[PDB]
Amino acid sequence: SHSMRYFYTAMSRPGRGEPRFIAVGYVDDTQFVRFDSDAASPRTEPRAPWIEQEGPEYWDRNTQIFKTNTQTYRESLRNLRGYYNQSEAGSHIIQRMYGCDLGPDGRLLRGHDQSAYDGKDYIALNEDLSSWTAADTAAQITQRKWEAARVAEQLRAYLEGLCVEWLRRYLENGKETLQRADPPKTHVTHHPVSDHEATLRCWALGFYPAEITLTWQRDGEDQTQDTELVETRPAGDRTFQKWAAVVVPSGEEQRYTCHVQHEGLPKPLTLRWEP
Amino acid sequence: VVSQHPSRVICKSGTSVKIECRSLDFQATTMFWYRQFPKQSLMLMATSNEGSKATYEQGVEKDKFLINHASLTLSTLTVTSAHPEDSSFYICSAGPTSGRTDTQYFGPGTRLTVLEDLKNVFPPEVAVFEPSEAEISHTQKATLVCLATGFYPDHVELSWWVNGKEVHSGVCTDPQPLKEQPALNDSRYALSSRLRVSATFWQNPRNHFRCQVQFYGLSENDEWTQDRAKPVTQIVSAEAWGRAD
């Protein structure tokens, strides 16, 4: 499965002047574009080598819409400030995520379009791609305007059309790096905390995509409550890292076995402390 | 909905005309200005942008038409030092969606008439001709005919008011007026209208019939040197009552 997403962040800055608009684009776990209105002459920039194949007309097309969003979000921020009876002295944030998910056939599997205000859900497009879910009555004012403007219809046309078509174009242009699955390099480590209890750590390294399952077991029984899992982190070279830890009493080290599940692995690997 | 002000303008050459375009129930970052000639097509002139300068189309004089995006709700078109060749129907559009243009809602349009001499302005004479006895006996229908004559320019709107309320059923008006003298540029026009009711409806004298002719002329500010009545924006009516025999 493959996906394309755009992440928008619009922040009001009363001290600094005019609101700032940032847009980043992703194909799965790979970032390929960025825009920041905070420049004298802002422009869309490539962030993945397979997108540099696109000519100048593509970069102008992206810049024109992101300049429109800069203007649009300045008003959305002003309007939302009114709905919540907020002071103009305060800094606020509108965030938005939208995109398409494809299946194994190059067809729209699921469409998305969600908005947030000050870090909380605001308005989201439903799975039917024709109706909205508003978080409160302020979001219902936005919903009224968006229904009158037929925003769900505009989104359905895009998610079913241009979103899947361009995601397919990107998948083909970056085929060797986007349609490749990097399996994790696994190893188990031992770290004593006391004389009679030691932490067993299971490592997953250099994997792509970020989607991974790490589970600790006691003779084939899940240790869900006792297992300490760290949030999947980027290595900085487009690969990911993750580890799972368990406080194991001295002597019962060979008893514990860890299980790794990833797209790049044909069979889920079972690992134990060696030697 | 989108509106415009004024709806009709009659001015002397050299005067500047300011036309407003307003989004009445939504905020618009963009508004489009069109010109419609007797050639039916919508010719895009300029695109009003908040708060940047206007985007003009090819073959449009920037200095003749000044576009200003005053706010998220108002755009103005100014026809500077107007001349009779600038006379046309100016219509605007706006929509709530920005970026790649979506649903557009048009204003009612502004009819601009530029004259070299304002002395040529005349209001209409309205008459109602009552149904033919020959028609009633022959078809059991009673056609009422209205006739507006001697008006200039073509700034007239006709309606039929039966018993105080406006009527649309069994009504047909000339789509365009006819020139009284088809040789000179300044030729007074004539327009006619028809309303068909049943024989029994015309026979009842309790029934009232009125042909309304709303005429758009000169404003209060315009100066009138001639002794004849000022041809100001007015309503000229002609009425008839039911006839029993």
């Binding site: 097309r61 992206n62 992101f66 509108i94 | 709530p96």
Partner: peptide, 9 residues
């Protein structure tokens, strides 16, 4: 390619 329309909230 991003969505090419934006509507004030």
């Amino acid at each position: 390619l991003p969505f090419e329309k934006s509507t004030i909230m």
